[PDB]
Amino acid sequence: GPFVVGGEDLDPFGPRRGGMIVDPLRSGFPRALIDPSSGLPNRLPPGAVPPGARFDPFGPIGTSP
């Protein structure tokens, strides 16, 4: 997944994506993937947290309902 390389370095438009150098951290690697609903008795609705907004997890990873 995040190991994509050379797609965007060869053609500005096209299905292929990726730069010249492989870097999962720069290609949407989950890093610490936490559910927004972690630490909650109920699951959050889809789109509750807008991307780019300051979010504080309600609990650690693994406490998702």
Partner 1 sequence: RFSPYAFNGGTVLAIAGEDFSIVASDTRLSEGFSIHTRDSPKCYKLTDKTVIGCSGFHGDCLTLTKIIEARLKMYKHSNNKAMTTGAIAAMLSTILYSRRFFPYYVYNIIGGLDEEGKGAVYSFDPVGSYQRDSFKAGGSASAMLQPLLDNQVGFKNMQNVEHVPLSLDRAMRLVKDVFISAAERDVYTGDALKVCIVTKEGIRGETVPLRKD
Partner 2 sequence: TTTLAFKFRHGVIVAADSRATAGAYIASQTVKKVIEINPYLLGTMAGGAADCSFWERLLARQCRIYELRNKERISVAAASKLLANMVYQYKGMGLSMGTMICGWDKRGPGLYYVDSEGNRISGATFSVGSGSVYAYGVMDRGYSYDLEVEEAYDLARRAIYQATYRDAYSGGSVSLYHVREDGWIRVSSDNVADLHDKYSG
Among 7, 17, 22, 28, binds partner 1 (CB under 8 A): 22
Dihedral angle, C-alpha 63, 54, 44, 26, nearest 10 °: -70
Is 56 near partner 1 (CB under 8 A)?
Answer: no
Tokens of 21: 């150098």
Tell whether the torsion through CA atoms of 46, 3, 12 and 26 is positive or negative. positive
Q: Which of 7, 16, 17, 21 binds partner 1 (CB under 8 A)?
A: 21
CB of 3 to partner 1, least distance (A): 5
Task: Report in angstroms how near the CB of residue 53 gets to partner 1 at its nearest.
Answer: 18
